Write a protein that binds this ligand. Structure first.
Ligand SMILES: Cc1ncccc1N[C@H](C)CS(C)(=O)=O
Length: 116
């Protein structure tokens, strides 16, 4: 509360670490469904069904222009990618399993990197 400060972690390296994590995501062989925005004119239903589309290139732009206030908002967008993927694709479709794989890959890196 007012004049009662909680010890807070060093966040000075968060931007650089989030960037390195995103790069590893981008270079994963199963990253191909998530590199660019889903083409709304090509995929029937996506615009109507998915209220908040997200992809790695959009995350990369937001990260590169100071649109993430903190690392938690960054993880929210990353998880949004895979949440959207689960909504629209069957679990054992090529795109569907890519999403499950990529989510698992992200969460371990997240823990290994920040949750010390
Ligand atoms: C991730 C996702 N989710 C739902 C449908 C498609 C996709 N990914 C596609 C590769 C994008 S497209 C078909 O090139 O426009």
């Amino acid at each position: 509360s007012m004049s009662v400060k909680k010890p807070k972690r060093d966040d000075s390296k968060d931007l650089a670490l989030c960037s390195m994590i995103l790069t590893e995501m981008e270079t994963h062989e199963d990253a191909w469904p998530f590199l660019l925005p889903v083409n709304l004119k090509l995929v029937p239903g996506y615009k109507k069904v998915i209220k908040k589309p997200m992809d790695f290139s959009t995350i990369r732009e937001k990260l590169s222009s100071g649109q993430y206030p903190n690392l938690e908002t960054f993880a929210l967008d990353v998880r949004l990618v895979f949440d959207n993927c689960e909504t629209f694709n069957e679990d054992d479709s090529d795109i569907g399993r890519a999403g499950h794989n990529m989510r698992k890959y992200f969460e371990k890196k997240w823990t290994d990197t920040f949750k010390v």
